[PDB]
DNA sequence: ATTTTGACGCT
């Protein structure tokens, strides 16, 4: 009743760039704009592995994790942009810099949590309050929401349906009550329209966004109407939306835990979770997951928007599959040095930009025939931004995996260096 | 022989 808090305190947005790496290449190369295109890594093996796909190319069935030659079977006019290669490995600098452009714009509006190279959460609660105070009871015009969908509306062509649903929502709005959750979301969506306009104006990149009361709902909402649209998911829309939402569609439930929720409880959709008690869910999935599931299937989640715009770790990774696996000492040293050189470059620039220094070097490896993605992860001190020292320490720290009596055995199918434990400088 | 990352939980 009155004391059942409903998780309507906050206004949170998730902004995510549409086919991000492809848009970065399309800005740089106009010939790629408004075409089926994809971004790949490498080119010798099956034309390279696809990691980003324009929506034109998606209409042919091209997806991420597809080989480019297979994709070309689906889309013979597919255009391909290749990730930069440096020191014999993929170099993602162009996209990290494009990302920093986007993040710095979003930061002007509110405090953001960088959730990936192409997406950030925004806590808009304060900003919505300020804007409601500025409006002074003025109602919200549909002109202020040109790309906004209201999930679950209309009830009772695409743009036509969007405008119908928006009209229904705006007519139902109690603009006088500065404290109504639904009004707060609506004003949040006005600000998110402004944010996405600024992002497009100042970068050329288009994006989508979700507006709701928490991070999970904002993220789920963002995907409902991609590309180049934003979606308002209200508290009241949760029962219908969740009544047919596969559990795996909710962030963090797409893997083993989601599968066990399905198998143990004997359910399919998010909504069905509501029929279990908190204690029941805690019994099956632990106290934390259980509490979180009990509130999440009612649309409630409390995870804060962390004020963090920059990555907490800086890492360099390369796989060496099958017959390219590193089998000699010279090879492991040369590739550890290549990794350490790219890492050093990134870390020096990080220090100059962000006034901080990493203090811990993590070295991770895979050995051939190991089932696990990571076979060993060991850490050492990172005291100098010197690639030669970093590669020597990584070797010093992993060399006791070589069972050879000049050789390396088992051959290494992955090297991974990661700087962590940052400290102000 | 999708690859290259990065956050975060568990013990
Ligand atoms: N190297 C690498 N980069 C990746 C991988 N997966 C994604 N990226 C890169 C490429 C992606 O562009 C970017 C952000 O990933 P999304 O937001 O999940 N997909 P996108 O923005 O392309 O399309 P939309 O969001 O409109 O559905 O991260 C990967 O496995 N490896
Ligand atoms: Mg994206
Ligand atoms: Mg994303």
């Amino acid at each position: 009743g009155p004391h059942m808090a409903t998780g309507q305190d906050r206004v949170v947005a998730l902004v995510d760039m549409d086919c991000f790496f492809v848009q970065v290449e399309q800005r740089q190369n106009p010939h790629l704009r408004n075409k089926p295109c994809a971004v790949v890594q490498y080119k010798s093996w099956k034309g390279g592995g696809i990691i980003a796909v324009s929506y034109e190319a998606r209409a042919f069935g091209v997806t991420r994790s597809m080989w480019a030659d297979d994709a070309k079977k689906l889309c013979p006019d597919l255009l391909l942009a290749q990730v930069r290669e440096s020191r014999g490995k993929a170099n993602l600098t162009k996209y990290r810099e494009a990302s920093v452009e986007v993040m710095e714009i979003m930061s002007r509006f509110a405090v953001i949590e960088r959730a990936s190279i192409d997406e950030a959460y925004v806590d808009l609660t304060s900003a919505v309050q300020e804007r409601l105070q500025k409006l002074q009871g003025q109602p919200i015009s549909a002109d202020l929401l040109p790309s906004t969908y209201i999930e679950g509306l209309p009830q009772g062509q695409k743009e036509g349906m969007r405008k119908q649903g928006l009209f229904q929502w705006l007519d139902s709005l109690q603009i006088d009550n500065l404290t109504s959750p639904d009004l707060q979301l609506t004003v949040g969506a006005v600000i998110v329209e402004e944010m996405r306009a600024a992002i497009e104006r100042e970068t050329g990149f288009q994006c989508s966004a979700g507006i709701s009361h928490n991070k999970v709902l904002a993220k789920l909402a963002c995907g409902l109407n991609k590309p180049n649209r934003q979606t308002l998911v209200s508290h009241g829309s949760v029962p219908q939306l969740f009544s047919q939402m596969p559990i795996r569609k909710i962030r963090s439930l797409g893997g083993k835990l989601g599968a066990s929720v399905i198998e143990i409880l004997g359910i399919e959709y998010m909504g069905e979770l509501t029929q279990f008690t908190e204690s029941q869910l805690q019994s099956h999935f632990g106290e934390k997951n259980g509490s979180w599931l009990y509130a999440m299937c009612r649309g409630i989640e409390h995870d804060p928007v962390k004020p963090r715009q920059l990555p907490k770790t800086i890492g360099c990774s390369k796989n060496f599959p099958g017959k390219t696996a590193l089998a000699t000492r010279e090879q492991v040293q040369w590739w550890l040095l290549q990794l350490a050189q790219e890492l050093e470059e990134r870390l020096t620039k990080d220090r100059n930009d962000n006034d901080r220094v990493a203090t811990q070097l993590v070295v991770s490896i895979r050995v051939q025939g190991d089932k696990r993605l990571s076979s060993l992860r060991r850490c050492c001190a990172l005291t100098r931004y010197d690639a030669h020292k970093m590669s020597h320490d990584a070797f010093t720290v992993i060399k006791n995996c070589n069972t050879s009596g000049t050789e390396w055995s088992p051959p290494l199918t992955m090297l991974f260096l990661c700087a962590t434990k940052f400290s102000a400088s």
Side-chain angles (χ1 to χ4, degrees), chain A residues 1-129 131-135 137-156 159-162 164-425:
Chain A
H3 308 295
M4 247 164 198
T6 63
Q8 278 169 296
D9 252 24
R10 299 182 293 156
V11 182
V12 173
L14 185 278
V15 179
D16 184 290
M17 323 294 314
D18 304 335
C19 58
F20 185 45
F21 285 21
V22 169
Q23 286 201 90
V24 170
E25 300 295 337
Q26 285 172 325
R27 182 177 74 178
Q28 181 184 314
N29 183 352
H31 289 315
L32 305 176
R33 297 175 180 184
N34 306 306
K35 292 242 159 152
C37 53
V39 168
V40 299
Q41 296 187 124
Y42 308 119
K43 215 77 194 39
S44 263
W45 182 275
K46 312 187 150 139
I50 284 167
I51 58 172
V53 193
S54 79
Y55 282 78
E56 297 79 350
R58 292 182 197 195
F60 291 84
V62 184
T63 73
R64 144 191 208 285
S65 95
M66 214 171 263
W67 295 118
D69 294 346
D70 301 332
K72 278 287 203 176
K73 305 175 189 163
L74 294 178
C75 177
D77 292 327
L78 177 67
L79 305 178
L80 298 174
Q82 279 177 83
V83 159
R84 181 175 293 135
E85 271 165 77
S86 298
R87 332 199 172 69
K89 67 175 297 294
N91 176 0
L92 304 176
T93 303
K94 182 197 302 183
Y95 318 106
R96 292 193 185 94
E97 292 178 346
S99 178
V100 162
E101 286 183 69
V102 169
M103 298 307 175
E104 282 182 353
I105 299 162
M106 285 180 67
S107 295
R108 300 206 306 259
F109 294 82
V111 146
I112 76 169
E113 171 186 345
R114 177 194 201 270
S116 81
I117 197 159
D118 93 316
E119 76 215 71
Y121 297 94
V122 194
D123 199 311
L124 291 166
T125 317
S126 286
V128 160
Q129 262 33 64
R131 191 69 157 263
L132 268 164
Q133 256 293 67
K134 156 269 181 156
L135 285 154
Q138 154 167 243
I140 309 196
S141 147
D143 277 12
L144 293 171
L145 293 170
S147 57
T148 297
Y149 280 79
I150 313 284
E151 169 61 30
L153 292 189
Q155 48 107 336
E159 180 60 11
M161 284 268 303
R162 183 197 77 82
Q164 275 189 259
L166 181 63
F167 293 164
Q168 291 191 354
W169 175 257
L170 291 174
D171 290 350
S172 286
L173 249 200
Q174 52 173 317
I175 179 57
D176 55 318
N177 187 5
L178 292 151
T179 61
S180 166
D182 288 348
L183 185 57
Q184 293 172 349
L185 290 186
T186 308
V187 173
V190 167
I191 289 171
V192 176
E193 292 273 12
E194 291 162 4
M195 185 183 309
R196 297 181 43 243
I199 286 170
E200 186 173 7
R201 189 182 76 77
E202 299 174 34
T203 70
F205 303 140
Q206 292 180 345
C207 59
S208 300
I211 308 102
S212 198
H213 296 298
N214 52 68
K215 285 154 79 158
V216 161
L217 276 199
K219 173 69 176 174
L220 177 62
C222 176
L224 296 184
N225 283 293
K226 260 178 176 285
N228 197 31
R229 304 290 185 244
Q230 54 180 65
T231 300
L232 188 153
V233 160
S234 75
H235 186 77
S237 84
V238 170
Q240 288 239 71
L241 176 74
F242 276 12
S243 78
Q244 304 193 73
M245 183 72 40
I247 279 160
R248 75 186 166 263
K249 293 329 172 140
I250 273 59
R251 152 171 109 165
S252 78
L253 297 185
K256 282 214 253 253
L257 174 63
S260 74
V261 171
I262 287 155
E263 180 178 21
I264 293 172
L265 304 180
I267 65 177
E268 289 166 65
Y269 310 115
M270 215 41 206
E272 303 179 76
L273 273 167
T274 67
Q275 291 320 98
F276 303 93
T277 75
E278 193 172 1
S279 300
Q280 277 173 335
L281 297 172
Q282 285 177 318
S283 77
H284 291 297
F285 311 110
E287 253 152 47
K288 190 142 55 223
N289 286 334
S291 288
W292 182 86
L293 278 170
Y294 183 76
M296 196 62 259
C297 66
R298 300 169 163 77
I300 303 180
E301 201 230 8
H302 282 130
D303 190 20
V305 177
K306 298 177 176 186
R308 192 200 28 103
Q309 186 175 349
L310 313 174
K312 311 165 94 113
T313 57
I314 292 177
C316 310
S317 147
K318 186 171 166 45
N319 283 357
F320 304 89
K323 285 202 59 181
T324 62
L326 317 190
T328 66
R329 184 210 56 211
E330 293 288 350
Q331 258 189 318
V332 182
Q333 268 166 16
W334 192 80
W335 281 109
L336 279 168
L337 181 52
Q338 301 323 295
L339 282 197
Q341 280 173 355
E342 179 195 322
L343 186 54
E344 179 203 301
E345 197 164 58
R346 277 157 69 186
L347 282 166
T348 290
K349 183 238 199 163
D350 186 81
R351 203 216 271 118
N352 290 324
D353 281 343
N354 303 310
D355 302 313
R356 61 178 190 163
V357 162
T359 58
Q360 184 175 77
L361 178 70
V362 182
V363 196
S364 180
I365 56 61
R366 211 195 165 161
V367 278
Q368 184 142 267
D370 191 317
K371 57 170 176 67
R372 321 128 74 182
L373 294 320
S374 166
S375 295
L376 173 166
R377 179 288 211 173
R378 301 258 190 277
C379 71
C380 65
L382 208 180
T383 54
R384 295 202 153 96
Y385 286 3
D386 182 80
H388 289 271
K389 195 199 170 22
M390 256 166 306
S391 52
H392 167 64
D393 295 346
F395 187 66
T396 290
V397 151
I398 71 147
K399 60 185 209 179
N400 307 124
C401 304
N402 190 10
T403 37
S404 167
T406 319
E407 231 60 32
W408 202 287
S409 98
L412 297 200
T413 41
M414 182 263 297
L415 294 181
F416 173 82
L417 287 184
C418 186
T420 70
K421 251 83 156 151
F422 284 84
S423 177
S425 165

